[PDB]
Amino acid sequence: VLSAADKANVKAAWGKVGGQAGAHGAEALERMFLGFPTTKTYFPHFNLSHGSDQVKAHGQKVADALTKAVGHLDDLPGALSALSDLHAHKLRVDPVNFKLLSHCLLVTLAAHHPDDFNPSVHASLDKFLANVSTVLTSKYR
């Protein structure tokens, strides 16, 4: 799974994000919609203007899913079961969109916590999101 150093960096870094988890997931989805416009198609039902309520509310759901996964770093497949089948099977999300959101979460976190995003935290949070993306993309492979 992650090495023990990686788990420790992921847990502390997401631990000190704290209450801002919801806000960061929200701003991560905005930076992916603007920066990568092909991703706007999965959300037509939404209003995608800066500060939209649906984007704020869904931003909390994404971060709460990443706190469950920071909580169970070894139960990661079991923990994200419903979410792997909802993404691969039901929403058929293209794999690359998970590499784009992950990029916008590392940009959001650097912007808000310059202090904490040292190079090793950065490396542990990328391996953490690449393994979260592998679980969600697992019905494809």
Partner: protein
């Protein structure tokens, strides 16, 4: 790249705020820390054997400056990116055999160092303008792939 006028102002406006000789250094060491297979290509540079060693490395800093300088040049030639980066894609392809996927990874690590260094000023809009530029430079360094 097709940058509107509002986007080009947002990019050149953002770029006057960049300490080129602080950003480039931090961006090439994180590339080396975060995607270790890139270390292979700089192994002539010394001790790249751990985060603080990549990050404190003289040659990593001086070469990152050079890298972010090439970005600056390219920023005042957005309509002719290919032609400003043609000799440099011959260097990367023919001689260095750097896989094109890594042009993109270094483009996005520079987008993370910029958000880290500028905070609120590297807003979702500025990022989006700037992601187009990083894609254009990535394609421009890959045009000479022989």
């Amino acid at each position: 790249v097709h940058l509107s006028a509002e986007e080009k102002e947002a990019v050149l406006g953002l770029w006057g705020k960049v300490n080129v000789d602080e950003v480039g250094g931090e961006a090439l060491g994180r590339l080396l820390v975060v995607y270790p297979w890139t270390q292979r290509f700089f192994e002539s540079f010394g001790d790249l054997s751990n985060a603080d060693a990549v990050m404190g490395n003289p040659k990593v800093k001086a070469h990152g400056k050079k890298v972010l300088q090439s970005f600056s040049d390219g920023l005042k030639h957005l309509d002719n990116l290919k032609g400003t980066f043609a000799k440099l894609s011959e260097l990367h392809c023919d001689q260095l055999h750097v896989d094109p996927e890594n042009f993109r990874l270094l483009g996005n690590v520079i987008v993370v160092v910029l958000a880290r260094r500028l905070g609120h000023d590297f807003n979702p809009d500025v990022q989006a303008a700037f992601q187009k530029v990083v894609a254009g430079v990535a394609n421009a360094l890959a045009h000479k792939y022989h």
